[PDB]
């Protein structure tokens, strides 16, 4: 009986541990996706600001 | 005996998950911390290009 009970609880533990983990991984990928967009925007604003700095140096 | 076999497997499993889990979060936290210094810098390259622009605008 003690063994049976322990199997039950571990199985529930392993599920819970997987759920909790996949939840956090996703939300970290979230952050990562968002940062990727932001880096992408500020890299174009640099590309732009830069290009127009050049047309500016011309006249 | 089957139950013992199974409890061992489950206990070793639970440990593996937590470990794989800890490891994937670390790697993600490292990509984040990385993508915050890429954004940190591009986001300054702008505010100087923004200044260089302004002195250049009034010739
Ligand atoms: Cl398993
Ligand atoms: Na499983």
Curated annotation (Swiss-Prot), chains A, B:
<comment type="subunit">
    <text>Parallel homodimer; disulfide-linked. May form homotetramers under reducing conditions. Isoform 1 and isoform 2 form homodimers and also heterodimers with each other. Dimerization is essential for its antiviral activity. Interacts (via cytoplasmic domain) with ARHGAP44. Interacts with MMP14 (via C-terminal cytoplasmic tail). Interacts with LILRA4/ILT7. Interacts with RNF115.</text>
</comment>
<comment type="function">
    <text>IFN-induced antiviral host restriction factor which efficiently blocks the release of diverse mammalian enveloped viruses by directly tethering nascent virions to the membranes of infected cells. Acts as a direct physical tether, holding virions to the cell membrane and linking virions to each other. The tethered virions can be internalized by endocytosis and subsequently degraded or they can remain on the cell surface. In either case, their spread as cell-free virions is restricted.</text>
</comment>
<protein>
    <recommendedName>
        <fullName>Bone marrow stromal antigen 2</fullName>
    </recommendedName>
</protein>
<feature type="glycosylation site" description="N-linked (GlcNAc...) asparagine">
    <location>
        <position position="4"/>
    </location>
</feature>
<comment type="subunit">
    <text>(Microbial infection) Interacts with ebola GP protein.</text>
</comment>
<comment type="similarity">
    <text>Belongs to the tetherin family.</text>
</comment>
<feature type="coiled-coil region">
    <location>
        <begin position="1"/>
        <end position="59"/>
    </location>
</feature>
């Amino acid at each position: 009986a003690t063994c049976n009970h322990t199997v039950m609880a571990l199985m529930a533990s392993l599920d819970a541990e997987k759920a909790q983990g996949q939840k956090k991984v996703e939300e970290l990928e979230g952050e990562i996706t968002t940062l990727n967009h932001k880096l992408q925007d500020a890299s174009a604003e640099v590309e732009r600001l830069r290009r127009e700095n050049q047309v500016l140096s011309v006249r």
